[PDB]
Design a protein around this ligand. Sequence first.
Ligand code: 7MH
Ligand code: ZN
Length: 257
Amino acid sequence: HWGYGKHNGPEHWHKDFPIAKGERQSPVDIDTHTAKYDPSLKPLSVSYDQATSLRILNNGHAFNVEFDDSQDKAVLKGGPLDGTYRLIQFHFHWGSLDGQGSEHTVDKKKYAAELHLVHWNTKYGDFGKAVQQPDGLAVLGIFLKVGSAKPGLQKVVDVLDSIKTKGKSADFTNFDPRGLLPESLDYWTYPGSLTTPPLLECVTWIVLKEPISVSSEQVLKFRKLNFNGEGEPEELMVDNWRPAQPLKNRQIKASFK
Ligand SMILES: Cc1cc(C)n(O)c(=S)c1
Ligand SMILES: [Zn+2]
């Protein structure tokens, strides 16, 4: 099955998931000089005051922080979106070294990691029906750079030793995702896809311009997770990022001058 190694990595995925070579794949490089300011975009509205986290899960590819999405509690709207998108989970992509790890790049620059806050369009009723639609998802992508610690990240780092291997989960209640947000909500936006199989083309990407800073110690703890399950040879969970894909017939729009 798919993964991030030599024999099952991103260059292989197209054989089980042919949409890997589709017309709106993600991530992409954001060429800041070519991204046009769109004064018709709206400020993004991120309303996370009532977010209910439930659990954290090592799925063998990354970890997911999962939310109760059975009511309008943590929603994204505004920006490029029509209507209301409900937070279902967040996860990260990261490198073995600080110079790589993000999926989107900015003028070919890679950040150490990238956070994805995944939301589904409530007009489709649930996540499974939303990923069958071209406007079913909105993913808020936030870059991580190594520097000062992010205090709001520490509760996630401190639980990782409890979900070291594939299939492990832990209670993860009362986590507030507002502590993962940078000051500015200035963003780039373009139509794309999930960056992991099944690579579905459902995503309005909203990529914040401002990275958050995390400490070297925090990212080191991500790199101690394992892709393997308990009792299997150890394979560290690092470099779980897909490289940039062809932009094709798409334009990236900027919310800011
Ligand atoms: C819904 C979803 C799930 C995963 C694992 N990833 O990586 C993205 S970008 C989106
Ligand atoms: Zn992702």
